[PDB]
């Protein structure tokens, strides 16, 4: 499966980016994803 | 020394990261750790 990220007040799909996307502690139910990896998150 | 972070309305030492870090300009006050780099102030 993809991910996109959206606006809060308007919809709108863009794609996942750093600006939109902020470093956090790992969490039991964040969803976990084996491939298509945001490039945030791919290393 | 080591140093860890902990959290403002409960007491317990956690491993320090880029999560709960903010990069800041350098001030005297600031804690000249030569050994025992905290990972995120690894270039």
Same mark, same amino acid.
């Given at each position: 499966? @993809?991910? $996109? $990220?959206?606006?809060? %007040?308007?919809?709108?799909?863009? #794609?996942?980016?750093?600006? /939109? %996307?902020? $470093? *956090? %502690? %790992?969490? *039991?139910?964040? @969803?976990?994803?084996? /491939? /298509?990896? #945001? #490039? #945030?998150?791919? @290393?």
């Amino acid at each position: 499966t @993809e991910w $996109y $990220y959206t606006g809060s %007040s308007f919809f709108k799909p863009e #794609p996942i980016t750093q600006a /939109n %996307s902020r $470093y *956090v %502690s %790992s969490d *039991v139910k964040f @969803e976990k994803l084996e /491939n /298509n990896l #945001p #490039p #945030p998150l791919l @290393e």
